Write a protein that binds this ligand. Structure first.
Ligand SMILES: C[C@@H]1O[C@@H](O[C@@H]2[C@@H](O[C@H]3O[C@H](CO)[C@H](O)[C@H](O)[C@H]3O)[C@@H](O)[C@@H](CO)O[C@@H]2O)[C@@H](O)[C@H](O)[C@@H]1O
Ligand SMILES: C[C@@H]1O[C@@H](O[C@@H]2[C@@H](O[C@H]3O[C@H](CO)[C@H](O)[C@H](O)[C@H]3O)[C@@H](O)[C@@H](CO)O[C@@H]2O)[C@@H](O)[C@H](O)[C@@H]1O
Ligand SMILES: C[C@@H]1O[C@@H](O[C@@H]2[C@@H](O[C@H]3O[C@H](CO)[C@H](O)[C@H](O)[C@H]3O)[C@@H](O)[C@@H](CO)O[C@@H]2O)[C@@H](O)[C@H](O)[C@@H]1O
Ligand SMILES: C[C@@H]1O[C@@H](O[C@@H]2[C@@H](O[C@H]3O[C@H](CO)[C@H](O)[C@H](O)[C@H]3O)[C@@H](O)[C@@H](CO)O[C@@H]2O)[C@@H](O)[C@H](O)[C@@H]1O
Ligand SMILES: C[C@@H]1O[C@@H](O[C@@H]2[C@@H](O[C@H]3O[C@H](CO)[C@H](O)[C@H](O)[C@H]3O)[C@@H](O)[C@@H](CO)O[C@H]2O)[C@@H](O)[C@H](O)[C@@H]1O
Ligand SMILES: C[C@@H]1O[C@@H](O[C@@H]2[C@@H](O[C@H]3O[C@H](CO)[C@H](O)[C@H](O)[C@H]3O)[C@@H](O)[C@@H](CO)O[C@H]2O)[C@@H](O)[C@H](O)[C@@H]1O
Ligand SMILES: [Ca+2]
Ligand SMILES: [Ca+2]
Ligand SMILES: [Mn+2]
Ligand SMILES: [Mn+2]
Ligand SMILES: [Mn+2]
Ligand SMILES: [Mn+2]
Ligand code: NA
Ligand code: NA
Ligand code: NA
Ligand code: NA
Lengths: 292, 292
């Protein structure tokens, strides 16, 4: 089953992602194929999949940027029916905005079926053009047709997945305790994480004993990523991944506060030094506390 | 012995505090008697007392606002010698800026003796006027003279004192763990704590599931008090008190993130709700984690 989380949905045939055109919140904004840049935030191309509790393999798909929902226009079963962004809610009963999402016959890509119409999300003609129509279209669960096959590239971790990445790490103190604040986290590329750090003003901050020392830098960086999340996205029901860690050196006679983020493969953490914007696989401290 | 910490130094005879005139960082800025408002930040009237490791009962006195040091002009023993703010360091050997501070004959107020001159800090003529001269003056450790007696009104807590206030509280969970980030904290009046909250922009922030929920409010409020500390004071070697707490309700089926501060008497904590600016003696959660 598709997990709850944020996905970049990429056609199996051509390198086009499902895109809410101009990220517009207007009802009836076309959802189109568009090219994408890996290891960036693709601002109009991120979809929060919310499982519908009492319907198997069925979701709403909320555009992270617009906060509007993937909607089959008037729920029509006609091939070529418009797929648009439309106002809704995460657990709607509106079958226009309900999508059964299951593995295709290649066992890696998915097909996306409208719960009402039983027609599939289709990149019309496999057109690779920026702004290519996406429509509801007749099809089957089993056929190879790449127009209707979609890789769900997972952009978020659960709290359980973040916990696992930390526990993997070789720099966790025996006394470590972790404090989980949210359920589902957007993982930033370092390029974006760095940009939030720059736009925070922290690069200009001076170290001062107690009054602006490591703990103030680390907490200011987490607050800045929290502020960026709320200000950047209109969807709800997720957080941005940015950890704070307290650590102690091997000698046990010096402590440090710093940040951490997750690798591209979501499997491991990477330490971030908010006093200089460095990423490190070893920051010279073993974490005894984290909150994220 | 006088503890390390921040003091509002108030004459024993008249309601004048030791004041660095206009908070100026200029060398030779007069230190004067000035009236004060209790339960405010008295911006020009706060002094960080740093104990000199290998000299008994002897300190530097750094003006929290200016970052400059109480200085007996050319270390003269002449009665009426100017006491000014002057550039220095927390552990200087300059005897102009070293002060032996011990209980007076009334056992509650102190006298302040220059280590070099062995003359005392004196509110000349006990003048209660705003801008009254303070000078180094002949005297003795034992005499009653109120011109040379000073209440050291303690405005800061150690980490150990903050730990004690939390442990006192009746809303601490069995599983509580506390994470101490600094050593010495300025305690804010609620009036100031509230102002930092207002000036943060948090009063305008909307609750949003995960993306700006209780943990984001609580951490944004701690970051705002950290930013206010650095931006407001030029002295180093202290922090501003603002805690973050995670808590769980009696039923054990709901958790909440919030802030806390300390009472005027420094003995107890008070909970702060950053989603509405309320102070509560009971926020309906028992803390299982704090960092401050
Ligand atoms: C059958 C029809 O369902 C609803 O209308 C839908 C639209 O629904 C969504 O948008 C409307 C406002 O336009 C409203 O906010 C609703 O709660 C939301 O789910 C939408 O799916 C469009 C485009 O496909 O089709 C229908 O107009 C409902 O509002 C109608 O009353 C009616 O029951
Ligand atoms: C190249 C082309 O691929 C397939 O046709 C697709 C269409 O396929 C879907 O709709 C058709 C009916 O039009 C049929 O129901 C099929 O089972 C279903 O997958 C559709 O994807 C459109 C729009 O993108 O493009 C092509 O027409 C295949 O059936 C054709 O024989 C042909 O190989
Ligand atoms: C005896 C004298 O001590 C020092 O001068 C002090 C002044 O000292 C302080 O300010 C000066 C700059 O004016 C400098 O930054 C020094 O490090 C700092 O402690 C000051 O206390 C004044 C006013 O009472 O008196 C003396 O001028 C030293 O700099 C001199 O070289 C000389 O040794
Ligand atoms: C009212 C006045 O109080 C005392 O005199 C103080 C001064 O006291 C201090 O300096 C004098 C010498 O001038 C002497 O050394 C004394 O032991 C010492 O405390 C001084 O505080 C000045 C400046 O504020 O004010 C008064 O002159 C007392 O000795 C006087 O008899 C008289 O009662
Ligand atoms: C917010 C906006 O993002 C980018 O423009 C989007 C565009 O983004 C995708 O396509 C571009 C090339 O046009 C790149 O491949 C990006 O990596 C993709 O994410 C599309 O989403 C279209 C259609 O909705 O809208 C544009 O605004 C970027 O080019 C802009 O400078 C800006 O940052
Ligand atoms: C920063 C400045 O603070 C206040 O003025 C100070 C003044 O403050 C003290 O005296 C005033 C009355 O003049 C009140 O009692 C305050 O409670 C005291 O803290 C003095 O420190 C003088 C001498 O250095 O400087 C002034 O700037 C306040 O009146 C101003 O509006 C302003 O907030
Ligand atoms: Ca600090
Ligand atoms: Ca959050
Ligand atoms: Mn290590
Ligand atoms: Mn949360
Ligand atoms: Mn309780
Ligand atoms: Mn610290
Ligand atoms: Na439209
Ligand atoms: Na379901
Ligand atoms: Na002067
Ligand atoms: Na000492």
């Amino acid at each position: 089953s598709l997990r709850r989380g944020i996905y970049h949905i990429e056609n199996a045939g051509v390198p086009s992602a499902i895109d809410l055109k101009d990220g517009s919140s207007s009802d009836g904004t076309p959802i189109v194929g568009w090219q994408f840049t890996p290891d960036t935030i693709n601002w109009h191309q991120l979809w929060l999949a919310e499982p519908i509790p009492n319907v198997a393999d069925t979701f709403t798909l909320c555009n992270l940027f617009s906060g509007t929902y993937m909607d089959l226009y008037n729920g029509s079963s006609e091939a070529g029916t418009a797929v648009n962004g439309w106002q809704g809610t995460a657990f709607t009963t509106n079958p226009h905005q309900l999508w059964t999402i299951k593995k295709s016959s290649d066992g890696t890509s998915y097909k996306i079926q409208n719960y009402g119409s039983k027609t599939f999300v289709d990149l019309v003609n496999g057109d690779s053009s920026d702004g290519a129509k996406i429509a509801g279209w007749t099809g089957t669960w089993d056929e190879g047709n790449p127009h209707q096959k979609w890789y769900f590239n997972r952009m978020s971790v659960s709290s359980a997945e973040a916990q696992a990445a930390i526990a993997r790490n070789p720099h966790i103190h025996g006394t470590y305790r972790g404090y989980i604040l949210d359920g589902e986290y957007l993982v930033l590329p370092n390029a974006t994480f760095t940009q939030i750090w720059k736009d925070s003003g922290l690069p200009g901050s001076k170290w001062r004993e107690q009054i602006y020392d490591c703990d103030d830098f680390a907490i200011a960086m987490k607050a800045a990523v929290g502020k960026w999340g709320a200000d950047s996205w209109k969807a709800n029901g997720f957080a941005i991944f940015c950890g704070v860690m307290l650590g102690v050196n091997k000698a046990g006679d010096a402590a440090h506060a710093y940040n951490f983020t997750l690798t591209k493969d979501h499997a491991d953490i990477v330490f971030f030094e908010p006093q200089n914007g460095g990423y490190l696989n070893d920051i010279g401290y073993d974490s005894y506390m984290a909150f994220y």
